Design a protein around this motif. Structure first.
Motif, PDB file in Angstrom:
ATOM      1  N   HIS A 118      33.892  12.893  51.891  1.00  0.00           N
ATOM      2  CA  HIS A 118      32.539  12.433  52.142  1.00  0.00           C
ATOM      3  C   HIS A 118      32.355  10.972  51.699  1.00  0.00           C
ATOM      4  O   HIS A 118      31.841  10.139  52.441  1.00  0.00           O
ATOM      5  N   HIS A 122      31.424   6.947  53.658  1.00  0.00           N
ATOM      6  CA  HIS A 122      30.607   5.801  53.251  1.00  0.00           C
ATOM      7  C   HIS A 122      31.432   4.519  53.092  1.00  0.00           C
ATOM      8  O   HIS A 122      31.021   3.446  53.546  1.00  0.00           O
ATOM      9  N   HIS A 128      24.616   9.181  56.068  1.00  0.00           N
ATOM     10  CA  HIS A 128      24.513  10.627  56.074  1.00  0.00           C
ATOM     11  C   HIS A 128      24.162  11.156  57.452  1.00  0.00           C
ATOM     12  O   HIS A 128      23.511  10.479  58.249  1.00  0.00           O
TER      13      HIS A 128
HETATM   14 ZN   LIG Z   1      26.766  10.543  50.732  1.00  0.00          ZN
END
Ligand SMILES: [Zn+2]
Ligand SMILES: O=C1CC=C(NS(=O)(=O)c2ccc(-c3ccccc3)cc2)CC1=O
Ligand SMILES: [Ca+2]
Ligand SMILES: [Ca+2]
Ligand SMILES: [Zn+2]
Length: 163
Positions: A118, A122, A128
């Motif tokens: 995850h 980024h 998101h």
């Molecule tokens: Zn995040």
């Protein structure tokens, strides 16, 4: 653009460095979690991630507690598990993991591989997703970690930036 705020890397071969480790896992287990998290993105994009053992990398990975020099303090067990910075020089791309978490490579809370995957979204320029099946969904959920399969929404995201 498509997601302004977040930019993108100008080259496809990026280096990474693991600066320190967590007592919750062996060094090999941390190395494997991080490597495989990068691989998820690599097999859906042109990106190639190269590990260095010392020195300056594009993407620094580290475990820190509470205040740790970047104005976004961690918060102790649970809550914020990790964070990362958008593509850019210096702290850009870097990923920090809360050292006060129980980190695992199982289905018990906060599988490091899943959280790292995850965060690296980024680091590569993704925000998101509202898709609860997506890795980039804001909240932690366990998903099977048996192969290098990225959820389709995340494939759509990384393809939209890098092809
Ligand atoms: Zn995040
Ligand atoms: O910049 C930040 C900082 C903190 C965030 N939340 S988190 O560290 O508690 C976190 C939430 C979900 C995950 C995750 C969930 C499911 C699969 C993989 C990772 C990992 C970390 C998300 C974020 O984007
Ligand atoms: Ca925390
Ligand atoms: Ca960096
Ligand atoms: Zn940080």
């Amino acid at each position: 653009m498509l997601t302004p705020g977040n930019p993108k890397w100008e080259r496809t071969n990026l280096t990474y460095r693991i600066r320190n480790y967590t007592p919750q896992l062996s060094e090999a287990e941390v190395e494997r979690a991080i490597k495989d998290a990068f691989e998820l993105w690599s097999v859906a994009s042109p990106l190639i991630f190269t590990r260095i053992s010392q020195g300056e990398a594009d993407i620094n990975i580290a475990f820190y507690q509470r205040d740790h020099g970047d104005n976004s303090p961690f918060d102790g067990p649970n809550g914020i598990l990790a964070h990362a910075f958008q593509p850019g020089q210096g702290i850009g791309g870097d990923a920090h993991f809360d050292a006060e978490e129980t980190w695992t490579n199982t289905s018990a809370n906060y599988n490091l591989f899943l959280v790292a995957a995850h965060e690296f979204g980024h680091s590569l320029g993704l925000a998101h997703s509202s898709d609860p099946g997506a890795l980039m969904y804001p909240n932690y959920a366990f998903r099977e970690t048996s192969n290098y399969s990225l959820p389709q929404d995340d494939i759509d995201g990384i393809q939209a930036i890098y092809g």
